[PDB]
Amino acid sequence: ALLNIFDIAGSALAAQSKRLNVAASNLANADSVTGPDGQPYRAKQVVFQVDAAPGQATGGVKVASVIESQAPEKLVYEPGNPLADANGYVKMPNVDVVGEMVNTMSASRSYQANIEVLNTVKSMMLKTLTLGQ
Amino acid sequence: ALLNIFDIAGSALAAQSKRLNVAASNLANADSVTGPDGQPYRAKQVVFQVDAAPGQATGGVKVASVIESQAPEKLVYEPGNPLADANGYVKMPNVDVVGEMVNTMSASRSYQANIEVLNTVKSMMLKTLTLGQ
Amino acid sequence: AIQGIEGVISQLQATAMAAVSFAGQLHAALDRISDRQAAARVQAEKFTLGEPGIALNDVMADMQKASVSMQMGIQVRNKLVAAYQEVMSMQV
């Protein structure tokens, strides 16, 4: 379907968009006490794999799944909350603020770099077709 | 012997396309952490050789092989990510973004130059075919 | 034919006892040019199909080569016809 460069750069754009979405969702839920069921929000992470279609030669980036972080959930002593345990510590998400802003900046700069790569390739693509005519 | 220019410039175009593809694959995976085998993505680069069989004076260019770039793997301290080292040193690819962008630009320019060579050569072949007429 | 095979064995006997052309060359040139054009067209259709491994560079270069070969054939035909007309114009 897609040309190889198109597929690689478009996969890069989609992967960076997914990472930015995960960062934004984490930054929104930084102060959430409960979900829809009664469990604390867990910071999400996105794992980049190389989609090496040929044997070890090249390939874009794919995202296998969005994993839930395994870090000590923040404990805040609020015994009056219905979600407090026997000891009374309500669970707040493990979303760090600085890491998510850094992730947003890095995802934006990778997105823009891949955009520039596509823009650069495009002129050569259109100029290839003048070879025959 | 203007026909050999077709082969020379076509080989050059294919080699520059392969180089641009490899550079874009490296750039799109600068943020990757995992490969299909779990290994960290290693930045790769093509090798250019003169496409001359033994006894041939000058030919085009050919891609001998794709080799892993020689650079220290970028160590990141994240001993919370499921992928880690003994001391929590996540290994990230050694992609130098500026180098890859410059490589993409250079490959595009060389590609366009070879296209111009092919165009003017075809024009000359037609004019030669209109020798006496 | 049965008589045709008789003639074949007769020509084999002739070879036993005994012990390419301009039209052929023109036919060979036409076949070569047509085969090149068909190869370029087939590769172009394969690329348009979406099958992997076919590069636009090769497609465009092969179309270029096929066009040059067609033009060469056209020029050869033009001259050949001109020479035939010149010969037939000779007064005997």
Binding site: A1, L2, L3, N4, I5, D7, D51, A53, P54, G55, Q56, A57, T58, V121, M125, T128 | A14, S17, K18, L20, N21, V22, A24, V46, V63, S65, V66 | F47, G50, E51, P52, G53, I54, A55, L56, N57
Partner: peptide, 13 residues
């Protein structure tokens, strides 16, 4: 060969 060109159709068919 091992590396497909940038202007080639997705290796993944």
């Amino acid at each position: 060969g091992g590396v497909p060109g940038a202007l080639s159709n997705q290796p993944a068919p």
